[PDB]
Symmetry: C2
Subunit: 419 residues, 2 copies
């Protein structure tokens, strides 16, 4: 069902904010143009002012005071490096309406259908033209509402963007920001001189699509974790390791790769706790590093799930302060950072990528009318990319959203639920 | 030219040696039946008693006193585990003669031709039948001599077998053993209870042939090491890392693997210095562990040699005391150790294996008539296996002995000398 635009506003900060050219660290620069957009769904409560646009716009405005750089624009320094000009220009807030309803979306799988709930940007007018944040509220025929979110990635990672949405929602409820952002990315300066200690494969470029979401209950996760006993393995891995291993292996098995073929899994990892000393709480920026375990598909399939899990485990444990400092230094010495961005090539078969939203507060956005019944990626831009979502109800379950070739999706599902 | 057997003797220790059932550690058990056999070549000196068989047999006899278990036989304990029965039965010493000459062997490449200089064993009569050590001295028409050596691997690794040959040669010169062997493999007991910390892929079984030797001078090794600067890499690797990387990559490139294909390199590594506390000097046994770096052939080829070198570097640095203790414990928990032996499957294309004799005293065997002009593997049992040899003259050069499919050998050579 078509989606009509009712109203559009460039929401500026509630009062004047200070100016500043906000320096971008190397991990702020090695990101795609835009974050994976996100979508929330809420159910009507009966209340007459359910998601009152005015209440929201004002709330947005007030939130953009402590989070001022979010109202900024991308510009370049003397050296061609990208920085955020804190000019207070603001964020785009769009009011839309649909003749269809919320159940029309079913399982909320991140198909193309969902992109229509986030606004489309003209990222073809120069880098200073467009907003860092676009927000869309869509009003539904059965009283339901979706909030849709697009954030240009140079502004911040998912952890920091969500810090902002959440704080916006607190403000709607007449609260102040519980934890004010700390704004200074120079804490991620490379060392001088830059002296890398590893090779960083994660950053060296290689020289009909279906999308689905599959729920796994608390009991299936638990059964799945228990497979760590198979063939007398004595080492326990976490639920995440086993489930991410299981996803990798199901993808390999369903894609039908040969025994002797290589598969790289790309894993996104939050540096916030790994760094020493650790960042200030509410650090506003990007802090995602990448672990890339590598395997022969023969091994992954023909060994128990715990093998795949063990590769994910090793790769992640390696991501300590030394590795991350080294990766900052590695990036410092590279001639062109945008050359190193992972495109549609990176995840095509036989490779894969997996992001976990499990530790993200994706469900804390209560604007005064309750928590969302779902929050998820609003569209998947590439085949071979998958997301893992905690339960909107804290009932131990988890979903796997993933895009593959449509041919592989039937076997993929078959193998996922073989527990 | 045919090789005729003149005389055969089962050389027992010079006097009575003590009895003992010598326990085998887990790394003593996860070895093939026989070591790669070795061959030495010496030039005539003019002396009338050049390699006098009698002088040698007596010397052997005297050496087998401190190294008594070498004169032993394999037997099994109550549990079916293999141990060495120290019964003094002795070592086979064979005297042969050839109508051909030493130059007939040319570059000394480990072809089938060289197997004929080591005696053939009847390893088809039960495990107590045959000797642990067989030695052959061949006398040549131009006055030259080859010593050929076969050692059943349960007895010891190359480091320990060479400790023995060398000590034998000292004794021929009327010297005693410079460093007496320490005999007790219980220093490599697994922990109780056994608690592995890693998965040990090295030990989990997968579920027309040419042989050549290529010399690389001190200057080519040196040029090759210098390639570590390419594309602004700031990390230096050793000569060994770069040359082993280079060998791996040349093999991949010459075999003509696809971009997306996996290649495992198997690397033999001496645990003697890595363990904490370190073994006693002259430790008599096996102490070889295995590092297995893994790659996509696309990356190896299409990146500079230093990438391949960096994988070998990481894999080797991981081999610390914790990893080795963990690998002992891993083996303790496995139901069948002979199941885990690397066969002809392990090294076939697209995989490879590389052993380095660079730190081995392969040239110290002077029996009173000088050091050998060559020492090397006397035959290569599998395609995909390669050896690296230090210079018989300490002139900085190194050779690469390797077996491949004959088709790949021409390109292999081409790519090896592209420096």
């Amino acid at each position: 069902m078509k989606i009509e635009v009712k109203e559009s506003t460039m929401v500026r900060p509630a009062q004047e904010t200070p100016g500043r050219n906000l320096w971008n660290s190397n991990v702020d620069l090695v990101v795609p143009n835009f974050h994976t957009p996100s979508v929330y769904f809420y159910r009507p409560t009966g209340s007459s002012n359910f998601f009152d646009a005015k209440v929201l716009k004002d709330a947005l405005s007030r939130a953009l005071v402590p989070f001022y750089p979010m109202a900024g624009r991308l510009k370049r320094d003397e050296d061609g490096r990208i920085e955020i000009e804190c000019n207070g220009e603001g964020v785009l807030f769009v009011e839309a309406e649909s003749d269809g309803v919320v159940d029309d979306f079913g399982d909320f799988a991140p198909t193309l259908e969902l992109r229509r709930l986030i606004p489309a940007v003209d990222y073809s007018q120069g880098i200073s033209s467009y907003a860092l944040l676009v927000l869309q509220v869509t009003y539904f025929k059965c009283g339901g509402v979706s909030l849709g979110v697009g954030m240009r990635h140079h502004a911040a990672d998912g952890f920091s963007g969500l810090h902002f949405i959440n704080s916006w929602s607190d403000m709607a409820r007449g609260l102040d920001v519980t934890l004010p952002p700390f704004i200074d990315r120079t804490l991620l300066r490379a060392r001088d001189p830059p002296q890398p200690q590893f090779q960083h494969i994660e950053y060296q470029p290689p020289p009909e699509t279906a999308v689905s979401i599959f729920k796994l209950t608390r009991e299936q996760i638990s059964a799945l974790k228990a497979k760590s006993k198979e063939d007398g393995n004595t080492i326990s891995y976490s639920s995440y390791e086993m489930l991410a291993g299981h996803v990798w292996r199901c993808a390999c098995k369903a894609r039908g790769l040969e025994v002797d073929q290589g598969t790289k899994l790309y894993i996104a990892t939050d540096g916030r706790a790994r760094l020493r000393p650790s960042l200030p709480p509410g650090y506003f920026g990007n802090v995602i590093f990448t672990a890339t375990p590598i395997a022969i598909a023969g091994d992954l399939e023909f060994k128990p799930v715990w093998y795949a899990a063990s590769k994910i485990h090793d790769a992640l444990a390696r991501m300590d302060n030394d590795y991350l400092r080294s990766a900052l230094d590695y990036l410092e010495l590279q001639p062109d950072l945008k050359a190193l961005v992972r495109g549609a090539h990176t995840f095509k078969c036989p490779n894969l990528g997996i992001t976990s939203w499990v530790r993200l507060p994706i469900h804390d956005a209560d604007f005064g009318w309750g928590r969302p019944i779902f929050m998820g990626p609003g569209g998947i831009a590439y085949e071979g990319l998958s997301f893992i979502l905690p339960s909107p109800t804290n009932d131990g379950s988890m979903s796997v959203a993933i895009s593959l070739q449509g041919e592989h999706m039937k076997l993929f599902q078959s193998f996922l639920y073989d527990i």
